[PDB]
Amino acid sequence: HHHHHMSSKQFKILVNEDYQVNVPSLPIRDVLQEIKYCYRNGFEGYVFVPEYCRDLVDCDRKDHYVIGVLGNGVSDLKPVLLTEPSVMLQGFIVRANCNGVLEDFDLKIA
Secondary structure (H helix, E strand, C coil): CCCCCCEEEEEEEEEEECCCCEEEEHHHHHHHHHHHHHHHHCCCCEEEEHHHHHHEEEEECCCCEEEECCCCCCCCEEEECCCCCCEEEEEEEEEECCCCEEEEEHHHHE
16 A cells, blocks of 8 residues: 655755856766765755746756756656756756855655
8 A cells, every 4th residue: 555755855955046157067877876966965056947047047068968856746856958848847956156045945856
């Protein structure tokens, strides 16, 4: 029998809705390892950019990946391209040093 239990972590991440940022992207194998690192150690050095603010994110390697946040409630962390069209995309967690506001995120690995 299935039994509901907590299987995700809570993180306080800086949210960027105001500033244009140029961010690094990675090959898919490296982003999968980076998502494991962040799930264990947190998101220092990262900001979350909501999907409605996607035009704020520049990148020199559009063929490579960033951290995507997918789904409602408990969101999944998955490698995504910045052009990801999924209607389930909440936003991106990208390396940046800009100002923002603090928000809570309930996350697990895809």
